Amino acid sequence: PKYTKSVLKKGDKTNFPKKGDVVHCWYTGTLQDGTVFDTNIQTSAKKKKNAKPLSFKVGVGKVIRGWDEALLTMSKGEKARLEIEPEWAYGKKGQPDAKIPPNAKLTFEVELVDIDLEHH
Numbered sequence: 001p002k003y004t005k006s007v008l009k010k011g012d013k014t015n016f017p018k019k020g021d022v023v024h025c026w027y028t029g030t031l032q033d034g035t036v037f038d039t040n041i042q043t044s045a046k047k048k049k050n051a052k053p054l055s056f057k058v059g060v061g062k063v064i065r066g067w068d069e070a071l072l073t074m075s076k077g078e079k080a081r082l083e084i085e086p087e088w089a090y091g092k093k094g095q096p097d098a099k100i101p102p103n104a105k106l107t108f109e110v111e112l113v114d115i116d117l118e119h120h
């Protein structure tokens, strides 16, 4: 498969994003060697009432393929470890600014915090 998902914390098994919904996520991205290339989890004395999760419309190409596909399988509250093959991430180009090399399998911890039913 082009990604794998391991559930770290079960969601509500009830509310799954549909294409066109807006999802709200916390994440940490790592390379296979363990290098953290990004996180939106704030470590400054900021937390609640300062930092906001990442919001995007799901299933329409706004994120790398691995995320767009995996999110549709997650329920609200779920925290999962996604291992995304390069073709469903940054492929041959990589991403120079984030120091992601060509052909990089990416690991993301993703927590789906909320869903707005924008598919309506």
Ligand SMILES: C=CC[C@@H]1/C=C(\C)C[C@H](C)C[C@H](OC)[C@H]2O[C@@](O)(C(=O)C(=O)N3CCCC[C@H]3C(=O)O[C@H](/C(C)=C/[C@@H]3CC[C@@H](O)[C@H](OC)C3)[C@H](C)[C@@H](O)CC1=O)[C@H](C)C[C@@H]2OC
Residues within 6 Å of the ligand: 027, 029, 037, 038, 054, 056, 061, 062, 063, 064, 067, 089, 090, 095, 097, 098, 100
């Ligand atoms: C208003 C400003 C623009 C706006 C940018 C921001 C808000 C800042 C944003 C949080 C983080 C950065 O995004 C620029 C940053 O995120 C990474 O650190 C990262 O962890 C990552 O991979 N993420 C973020 C978390 C969701 C999955 C994935 C993604 O898919 O992110 C999306 C993404 C980059 C999609 C492209 C779209 C075009 C395709 O061609 C390409 O396909 C190859 C994939 C993000 C969320 C976009 O929807 C939102 C934006 O564009 C990259 C390693 C390097 C990149 O910095 C350079």
